[PDB]
Write a protein that binds this ligand. Structure first.
Ligand SMILES: c1cncc(-c2c[nH]c3ncc(-c4cn[nH]c4)nc23)c1
Length: 335
């Protein structure tokens, strides 16, 4: 009934609730599933007052129900009020993972073997997403769930789009910088690159007090971009800043990561290129020598049918969004 003083009405199927995490994606608890005799994850969402949350909620539900892949979190069950009027909250039931990459990298050290396997699962999952004509747009360590068996799943597709206020900027590609457009598939690639770098050193590769500071860190490592690579268009200010800077020298990757696999550093390099047009794509990344021990196209499935929202969710008012959410969740009701 209650968790930390907040209502969490998911019984009678789900009991023994234990609080695990808050977030912009809702309140997350673990719980014992009486039916499947296993502990699960349940996410409570209360999105119906803000058109934004209703969008994020609908995208998440719709995406994860259509998606089916080993390295992508699924939805076991959705609990909500039997009538649309009473529906204030929505509980999404998902597989309970032991941790996320953010919590792991905070305190634990990864060997190359783990890093290589984690990265493989990331890209394998990302290939499926991209084949679905979908951008994740928010890849970060906290969105990568893990088991002790080292199985990994990508989660939180609340900000996904078909191929604005920002929280964390550490994993955003330089071209999106400031509050700009999440446009190409290459932005996810950049995010994976940043995630790889963090796996190698247990620290954010590109931190910054503001986006100019962040950009400076990026040039501090990659070095000054060529005029051709200076396709920073989505801001006069950001572009004029870069043009003013003195030349900056590229730091050799092995100088930053002296204990890293050379192949890992080579692939890291192709992911973290300033020019998005020059970045390696997911299928070519899976075919990189660093991942050759796991590489197998026949075992790297694509989406059975690409995505295309039948209506512009941004244009829909919150009341109709609520209707579509109600309809989408119907199949988890009796009948
Ligand atoms: C969307 C957003 N946030 C968490 C989830 C999630 C589903 N199943 C899970 N299982 C374990 C965890 C976890 C987090 N931190 N430590 C463990 N999260 C989830 C989905």
């Amino acid at each position: 009934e209650m968790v930390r003083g907040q209502v969490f009405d998911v019984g009678p199927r789900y009991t023994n609730l234990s609080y695990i995490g808050e977030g912009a994606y809702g309140m997350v608890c673990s719980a014992y599933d009486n039916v499947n005799k296993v502990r699960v994850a349940i996410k409570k969402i209360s999105p119906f007052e803000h058109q934004t949350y209703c969008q994020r909620t609908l995208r998440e539900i719709k995406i994860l129900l259509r998606f089916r892949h080993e390295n992508i979190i699924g939805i076991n069950d959705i609990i909500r009020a039997p009538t649309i009027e009473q529906m204030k909250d929505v509980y999404i039931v998902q597989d309970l993972m032991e941790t996320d990459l953010y919590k792991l990298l905070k305190t634990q050290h990864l060997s190359n073997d783990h890093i290589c396997y984690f990265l493989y699962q990331i890209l394998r999952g990302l290939k499926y997403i991209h084949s679905a004509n979908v951008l994740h747009r928010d890849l970060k360590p906290s969105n990568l769930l893990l088991n002790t068996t080292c199985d990994l799943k990508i989660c939180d597709f609340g900000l996904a789009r078909v191929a604005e206020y920002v929280a964390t900027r550490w994993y955003r590609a330089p071209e999106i910088m400031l509050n700009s457009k999440g446009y190409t598939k290459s932005i996810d690639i950049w995010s994976v690159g940043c995630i790889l770098a963090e796996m190698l050193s247990n620290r954010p590769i590109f931190p910054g007090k503001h986006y100019l500071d962040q950009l400076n860190h990026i040039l501090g490592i990659l070095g000054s971009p060529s005029q051709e690579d200076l396709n920073c268009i989505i801001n006069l200010k950001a572009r004029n800043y870069l043009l003013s800077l003195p030349h900056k020298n590229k730091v050799p990757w092995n100088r930053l990561f002296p204990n890293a696999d050379s192949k890992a550093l080579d692939l890291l390099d192709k992911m973290l290129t300033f020019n998005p047009h020059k970045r390696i794509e997911v299928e070519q990344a899976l075919a990189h020598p660093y991942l050759e021990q796991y590489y197998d196209p026949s075992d790297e499935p694509i989406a059975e049918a690409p995505f295309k929202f039948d209506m512009e969710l941004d244009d829909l008012p919150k009341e109709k969004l609520k209707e579509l959410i109600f309809e989408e969740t119907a199949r988890f009701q009796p009948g």
